[PDB]
Each structure stands twice: as structure tokens, then as C-alpha cells.
Amino acid sequence: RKRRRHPS
Amino acid sequence: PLESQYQVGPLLGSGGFGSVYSGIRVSDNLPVAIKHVEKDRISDWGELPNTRVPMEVVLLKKVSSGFSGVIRLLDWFERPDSFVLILERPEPVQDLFDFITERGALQEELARSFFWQVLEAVRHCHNCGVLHRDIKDENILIDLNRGELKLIDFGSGALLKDTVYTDFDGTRVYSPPEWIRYHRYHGRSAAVWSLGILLYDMVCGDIPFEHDEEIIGGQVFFRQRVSSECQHLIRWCLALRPSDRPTFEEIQNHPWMQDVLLPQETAEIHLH
Ligand SMILES: NNC(=O)c1cc(Br)c(Br)s1
Fold first, then answer.
1. Is B177:B215 a contact under the CB 8 Å cutoff?
2. Residues B102 and B221 in one domain
3. Do B124 and B6 sit in the same domain of this protein?
4. Does the keyword Cytoplasm apply (chain B)?
5. How distant is the Cα of A8 from the closest Cα of chain B, in angstroms?
6. Across the interface, do B169 and A3 touch by the CB < 8 Å criterion?
7. Where are the alpha helices (DSSP H) in chain B?
8. Cα distance from B15 to chain A (closest Cα, Å)?
9. Which of B28, B39, B69, B229 is deepest in the core (most CB within 10 A)?
């Protein structure tokens, strides 16, 4: 299951 | 002159936080990080004792005195179109997002030590009048040899206040349901929500929610074996109503938080 960064 | 006081190395990363280079202070060979931020991309501004700087510089100076779990601002410069920030660089270092990606879900002993250190660092920010507003694994560096965690990237932060916040530019998947639903939140209780997201991330290997409907739905499914005490602390931090969340004192007195490892023990057992 894909894990990802998230921008800010 | 910035360019002669520092030897610039490879780009470490770029994003909403600017462009960050590895570096070396030419005077004593101190390892540093050099962050460039374009002036046009700076939404909030502040003032120091007397000089019109990015809010990020204001907040970093308020937390950078003495020793703490925050990466310290050593210097800054103004350029025609940008500000340049010199930050203290630990070596070797890895951010907590990459660490969790490579390791998977963390043993609870290790997550307890990490989460404890993050709590102490956030308490230090709040004691200095600083609300970070973007607590997440990506904004946490691990000093691998010392076993110490450091907060980075205050560019979404604010002065801490007790009245309502109606603006937000942190990471949405760590933001609380009252922001999603109403565009309103208070500083401390919103921070506790993001700490619940972070702790779940540590013990399960990824964050619990990706979509707005999951965030406001307030059901926490555990995808890994997690102790009942840890599940309880996480669900408490993730209470839908902000006033149902624990204080920092209540988090640190929770039974799951007892008998934390020291930083050096943490490195020797889990990082070396
Ligand atoms: N956004 N990134 C920073 O503020 C960073 C500071 C240090 Br030290 C590293 Br390594 S990265």
C-alpha cells in the first residue's frame, strides 16, 4: 500500500 | 558576505519550504544547512526587535536560544529577491518520514522515545510563544548518532495566541476536523490532533487518514498490532471535539508514555 509525502 | 563565509554543497531538497543546501561554515568547518526562500513566495511577515523579516525568521529566533529539540537558526541574510537562512546541521541525519518508510511500523519502545522528544520540542515552542502548525514526520530530523529529534520548517507557523485561527497553510492530512469543517481552530488543540496523526504514523507505518471525509469521520482503524494503551492515547489525541483532546501534561502522564528511554539509549538500542 502506497505511502506518500504531502506538500505544505 | 554570505558566499565567502560558507562553502555550499549539494541540494538536499526543495518544496514549500524553499531550496535547502548542505553546507559548511568556513570559519570552523561547522556543518550547516542553507535555506533560500524567494520573497514573492512569503505570505506572512513579522518584525524583530526593530526589521521586517519573514515570519519564519521571527519564529526561529524566538525558539533558537539555549538547547532544545528544534533546529537552531545561526544566521540569516537578505538578498534582493530572497532571504537566506543558515541552520545547524546534524550529521548523520535522516528525516522521520524516510526513517518510517525504510523501517516500517516502529516498535512501541522506539515510538515512545521519539514521540516523547517531539512533545518536549513542541512544549518548548509554545513556551517561547511559537505555534509550529505543520508537525509531521517530514518536519522532524533524527540525529542518528545522538538519538535526538529536531523540528524543522517553521514557514507555516505563527505567534501562539489563545484566540481562534482562521488561516492555515500546513499539511492538510495532519489538520484537524474543525479546520476541514469550519476553517477555525485553536492552537494547542490543533497541535494535539497533529500529534495523534504523528503517533499513529509511527506505530502503524503510515498516517490514518488521506481524505477529508476520513478526517471528519473520526473512526481510527489500526492496521498494525498496537497495544491497548497506545490505541487509547491515539484515539484521545484524535477526539473529534477539540475540548475532548488531552493537554500536553495529560499526554505525558498517560500510562503509555511511562519509562521513556534516554536519547543515547535510544540510539544504542535502535539506531546504531
Ligand atoms: N527544510 N529543511 C530544513 O530546514 C533543514 C535544516 C537542516 Br539542519 C536540514 Br539537513 S534540512
1. yes
2. yes
3. no
4. yes
5. 5
6. no
7. 2-5, 55-63, 96-103, 108-127, 177-182, 187-204, 212-217, 228-237, 248-253, 263-266
8. 7
9. B69
